[PDB]
Design a protein around this nucleic acid. Sequence first.
DNA 1: ACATAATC
DNA 2: GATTATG
DNA 3: ACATAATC
DNA 4: GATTATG
Lengths: 60, 60
Amino acid sequence: GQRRSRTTFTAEQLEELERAFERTHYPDIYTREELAQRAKLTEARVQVWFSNRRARWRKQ
Amino acid sequence: GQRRSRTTFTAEQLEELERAFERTHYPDIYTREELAQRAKLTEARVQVWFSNRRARWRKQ
DNA sequence: ACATAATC
DNA sequence: GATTATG
DNA sequence: ACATAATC
DNA sequence: GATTATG
């Protein structure tokens, strides 16, 4: 029942991610893949980040 | 708003997957990773497959 | 503890 | 995305 | 069309 | 996992 360990993002990765979010809250597959590449993340990690970021935004 | 294209599984991959499901409907991260490796899939694709397989099982 | 990553 | 669970 | 992969 | 959407 073990789950994946919480990922820690580098300041640098967060930059790229926050940069993308500023442009769009719902990046398409193309955008998520290129961002994953740039950030040295998996597309899965990127998708999860965006879901969680949207949550934070609305929580405001 | 483009989404990832539907993945097609080889008969061989399905074998491994169905084999795993038979053992457990909720494989842990360890199991999903090793299965991804064996099957030449991403762990993301494996996780999604298991969710969808559970749905089929209950639909019965 | 809680902010937020992972699950489903 | 609502819920669960952890670095 | 629908079975089932992807989204969120 | 409920919902959305496609090979």
